[PDB]
Amino acid sequence: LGIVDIGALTLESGAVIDNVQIAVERWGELSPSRDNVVVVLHALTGDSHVAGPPGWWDGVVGPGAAIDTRRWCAIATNVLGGCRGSTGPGSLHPDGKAWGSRFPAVTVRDQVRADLAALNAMGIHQVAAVVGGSMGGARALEWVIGHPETVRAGLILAVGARATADQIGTQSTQVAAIKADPNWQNGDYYGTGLKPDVGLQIARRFAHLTYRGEVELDTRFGNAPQDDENPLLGGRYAVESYLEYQGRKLVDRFDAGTYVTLTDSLSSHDVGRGRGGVEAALRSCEVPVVVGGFTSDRLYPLRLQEELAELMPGLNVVESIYGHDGFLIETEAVGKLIRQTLELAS
Amino acid sequence: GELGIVDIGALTLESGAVIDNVQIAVERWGELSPSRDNVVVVLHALTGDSHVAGPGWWDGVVGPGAAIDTRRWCAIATNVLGGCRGSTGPGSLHPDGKAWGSRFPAVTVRDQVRADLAALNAMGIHQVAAVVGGSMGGARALEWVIGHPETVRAGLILAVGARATADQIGTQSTQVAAIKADPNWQNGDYYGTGLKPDVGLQIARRFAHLTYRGEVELDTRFGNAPQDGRYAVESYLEYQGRKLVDRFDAGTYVTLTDSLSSHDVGRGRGGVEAALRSCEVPVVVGGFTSDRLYPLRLQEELAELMPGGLNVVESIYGHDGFLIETEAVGKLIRQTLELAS
Ligand SMILES: [Ca+2]
Ligand SMILES: [Ca+2]
Ligand SMILES: [Ca+2]
Ligand SMILES: [Ca+2]
Ligand code: NA
Ligand code: NA
């Protein structure tokens, strides 16, 4: 885990963040010409820990993996706004306190420019490929549309061209649940000894449902009770105790302020903004791209990836029971799409 | 057009708990026939009540000339056991003078059916022509036809499944958790304290409303547009939450959401397949193509397993299609009433 200083960054809004730092992790050696970089773009609650025994995409990064680190140099940042090394709301403001409520709104476009600045500070100027799903797919899409000169190919998984009403609906309500927590303290809870654990748990429980496949959830849990508990006497259902576990697991590893900042960056995703709309922006693409979507995805439904593949100058439909999380679980299917993307960059 | 309160006395619930003096609120439209053979029971959904027709929550299908033509039929609607608009529920007074609150027992759909039947029986009604309902009302209709077939001549079951699913229990239990996390919940004993869990109930309803709508139509209506700083869809959801808080009780929301989570027509009957195959009542089953909460596969299962084809309603409105698609629902009601005649 290294930290790259990129200095002051001017955001799309005109706001400036002083002294931005971007955390970077690398697997594989950089080639003499620096022509073998594959940028792996993490999703909402991910980070730079892509691979290693555990890395959120370990199945696709390593020796002999889809991103074969004997040949490619896999680089992952922690996104701008994150909480695992990069500048975010918990980072220190110039006044010595956490940014907190003063942290500006960040867009996916800002996040791409911060990643590119980190690469440039490392002496890397063109990457072979960008790859990502979900928020990482939004980052990959904005990279190929906004900075095609810097990337030879892209894999865009499980995302749409802009945020949808249903996505903004659940995202805004997840944020509202966090802000309703008595410990949110307007986002300035850092250093107080209190954190909005309850609101973040509620947000994550609803988010987890959006990530899963409806049928698979019912196959896994049905209406089964939690073992030895009777719901009519105050007991819980199996899916209910599982959701409680998911919410608590996130609270134990993730910052509420970062969740809000990054969720907001999902809600403002729109490749068409300032470019004449989604269709005009997608038609402008000059980077070879592979697009994949998952049949059971309820958060970024397949129609969104059909649109990407139709408007960008065929869609890879992955039959999967795992919903949106298919982009993390379907190692072999995703691996084939990665290998196809890397062939386009070679 | 007056709200009547029917005393049904003591009710022993499926859990074994007993409520000493249950009251069920009732509204009626249309004259009861001399033989009492023209009763159509309308079963409301989670946040509905007995006010079906004025407007009422299903006003388009009840009235003179409507799908339930009150010139011929006597439409009767109760407020469900656990409710907050006249029937016994957590905000009702316990024998000790305080609200039931945290002492209110768990209520199942089967309990709700038995309370409705007891209210009808107290009014001298012993067999109904039809039961009709969608969503929680469809669960009530299904348990009525399976558990008490001798009391009903036909049923319309809309936008529900044979048991609660994992996704339904997931969102239901998390909506309840959001209410219970509100500082004003006070263990459910907030009645009379001057404080209510308005924020938690708003959060629950915002998430629930998304489950009731169609993904595509939400994007058609709002996209990522701003409001007039909120996004348009965000302002819409905030409005939906405030609207519910203004008219509905959090404790009842919890009690009735729990009743949805415990829905299972197979319990104590050998499982869903055995229970549905036992149906002796002609039923019409309807589902809506864009429903994200009770997806169409659940109604396919109902139709496949019940002795009785599925009526598939092409609708953009999601689960709320059962409330919005007046013409398609009306056709299904009229089919049901022909089976009862
Ligand atoms: Ca690996
Ligand atoms: Ca419970
Ligand atoms: Ca009417
Ligand atoms: Ca906002
Ligand atoms: Na700089
Ligand atoms: Na009685």
Numbering used by the authors:
A (entry chain B): 17 to 69, 77 to 336, 340 to 372
B (entry chain A): 15 to 68, 77 to 250, 258 to 337, 340 to 372
Give the text the authors published on this PDB structure:
Two copies of each monomer exist in the asymmetric unit of all three structures.
The three solved MetX structures include residues 15–70, 77–372 from MhMetX, 10–379 from MaMetX, and 7–372 from MtMetX. Thr61/61/64, Arg227/227/230, Tyr234/234/237, and Asp351/351/358 for MhMetX, MtMetX, and MaMetX respectively all surround the active site to help facilitate the binding of acetyl-CoA and homoserine. The extended loop between β3 and β4 show differences in secondary structure content, length, and orientation. Both MhMetX and HiHTA contain a short sequence with helical propensity adjacent to β4. All three solved structures crystallized as dimers at the expected interface and orientation that corresponds to predicted physiologically active assembly.
